[PDB]
Write a structure and sequence with these properties.
The PDB classes it as structural genomics, unknown function. The entry lists the keywords Protein Structure Initiative, Northeast Structural Genomics Consortium, nesg, Unknown Function. It forms a monomeric assembly. The entry is titled "Directed evolution and rational design of a de novo designed esterase toward improved catalysis. Northeast Structural Genomics Consortium (NESG) Target OR184". The protein: design cystein esterase. This protein has 410 residues and is an alpha+beta fold. It has two domains: 181 residues, 3-Layer(aba) Sandwich (D-Maltodextrin-Binding Protein, domain 2); 228 residues, D-Maltodextrin-Binding Protein, domain 2, CATH 3.40.190.10. It is 43% helix and 14% strand. It is built from 16 helices and eleven strands. Strands 1, 2, 3, 6, 9, 10 and 11 form a seven-stranded mixed β-sheet that branches. It has a two-stranded antiparallel ribbon with strand order 4-5. A two-stranded antiparallel ribbon has the order 7-8. A hairpin with a 2-residue loop joins strand 4 and strand 5. Helix 7 packs across helix 8, helix 8 packs across helix 16 and helix 11 packs across helix 12. The chain is globular, with a radius of gyration of 22 Å. The structure holds bromide ion (BR) (3 copies).
Length: 410
């Protein structure tokens, strides 16, 4: 009878994402014949920018694929997207680990549901480590000891792992959490949480790692975020014999190794006595509801359909990663779409099974912070600043960036 509801939904992706999403939408309309969905989809380029102007003028879509770091952009207050807590009758929030939802909560307002989550963990070149005669490290000391075994037994060009600056940042953060159980960012005070001495310690650990031949210094490899190592010869040759990176995108990296060598999942190094592995779990992307939607219930039903319903989940498959949704996981395992023997999947499973009560701030992902960190480690590697001067430099310049980024609500 009469009355129907017209929703708009955006997302970005390649044609492969477009096809399954378009397919999922058709299934949704089948089961909700009075709700139509107009799809607004492009590639990544220009997408944020277009959405930015829509959000500003209150003409954004009812349902949006969003990135985690858009919370600092659109929703410093938590009010930049619709509060998903207000539509829990349409949205089955129990399917998503409460802890993961904390990270997408701002000021007690749920701003998105992680479609999928991924953690930064260790994967190793199995051949190379067999050449070294080493078991993969279960402790930081073992990782450190591995650097010198690689150096003298295999050669100066061999390293246990190769690391982007940003990956190193996350790695040492992980160590610091294990030790002190505080986050890197103090959100409420809008500055870094570590003490001066802890900053000295943070960078002392970097120096200790490089001195111990754990990874190439920045004179040999120097990239902020771009995982460009996988196309380079020492990776392919098995000289850079491992990586610390998102579990979700491991296959591309492993296939570029000289066979029969592949990437296998490593243990996660633990300090003795720790109660938190200090893992970085990233919502790879989220679904959010437009702040200004005239249809929050139907938008909520669409999100619920895409993440939780049988034919929504089936359509969408693994085209946005392993779902966070519990029912989605169980369903995709039964159909054999999720295999526990996939290095990518087993890694997620290990990360989930490890203790990780410390969450991570979206402001931690700021590109200026990550760039600054490459600057900082270069000061150390190139002898231009002592570890202690670098810690004070990073603390100071970091705080300036944070302060500027954490104020200024659009
Ligand atoms: Br894309
Ligand atoms: Br240790
Ligand atoms: Br943090």
């Amino acid at each position: 009878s009469h009355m129907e509801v017209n929703l708009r939904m955006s997302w970005w992706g390649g044609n492969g994402r477009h096809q399954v999403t378009l397919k999922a939408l058709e299934e949704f309309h089948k089961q909700h014949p009075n709700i139509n969905v107009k799809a607004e989809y492009t590639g990544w380029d220009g997408h944020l920018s277009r959405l930015t102007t829509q959000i500003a003028g209150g003409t954004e879509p009812d349902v949006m694929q969003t990135n985690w770091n858009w919370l600092p952009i659109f929703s410093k207050d938590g009010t930049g997207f619709y509060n998903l807590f207000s539509v829990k009758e349409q949205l089955d929030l129990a399917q998503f680990d409460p802890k993961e939802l904390q990270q997408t909560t701002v000021n007690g307002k749920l701003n998105g549901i992680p479609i999928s989550v991924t953690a930064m963990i260790f994967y190793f070149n199995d051949a190379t480590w067999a050449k070294a005669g080493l078991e993969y490290p279960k402790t930081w000391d073992e990782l450190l000891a591995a650097g010198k075994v690689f150096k003298e037994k295999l050669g100066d060009q061999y390293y246990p792992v190769v690391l982007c600056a940003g990956q190193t940042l996350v790695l040492i953060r992980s160590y610091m959490t294990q030790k002190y159980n505080i986050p890197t960012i103090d959100e409420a005070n809008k500055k870094f949480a570590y003490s001066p001495e802890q900053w000295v310690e943070f960078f002392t650990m970097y120096k200790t790692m490089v001195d111990n031949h754990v990874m190439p210094s920045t004179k040999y490899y120097a990239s902020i975020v771009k995982s460009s190592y996988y196309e380079m010869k020492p990776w392919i040759n098995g000289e850079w014999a491992g990586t610390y990176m998102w579990n979700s995108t491991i296959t591309k990296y492993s296939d570029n190794l000289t066979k029969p060598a592949k990437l296998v999942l490593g243990p996660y190094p633990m300090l003795p006595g720790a109660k938190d592995a200090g893992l970085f779990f990233l919502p790879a992307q989220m679904l959010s509801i437009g702040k200004s939607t005239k249809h929050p219930q139907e938008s909520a039903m669409l999100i619920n359909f895409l993440l939780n319903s049988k034919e929504g989940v089936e359509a969408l498959g693994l085209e946005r990663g392993v779902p966070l949704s519990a029912t989605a996981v169980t369903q995709l395992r039964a159909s054999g779409v999720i295999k526990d023997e996939d290095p990518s999947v087993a890694g997620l499973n290990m990360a989930l099974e490890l203790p990780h009560p410390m969450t991570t701030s979206p402001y931690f992902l700021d590109w200026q912070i990550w760039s600054l960190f490459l600057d900082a480690i270069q000061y150390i590697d190139y002898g231009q600043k002592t570890v202690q001067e670098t810690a004070e430099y990073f603390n100071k310049q970091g705080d300036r960036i944070l302060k500027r980024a954490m104020r200024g609500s659009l």
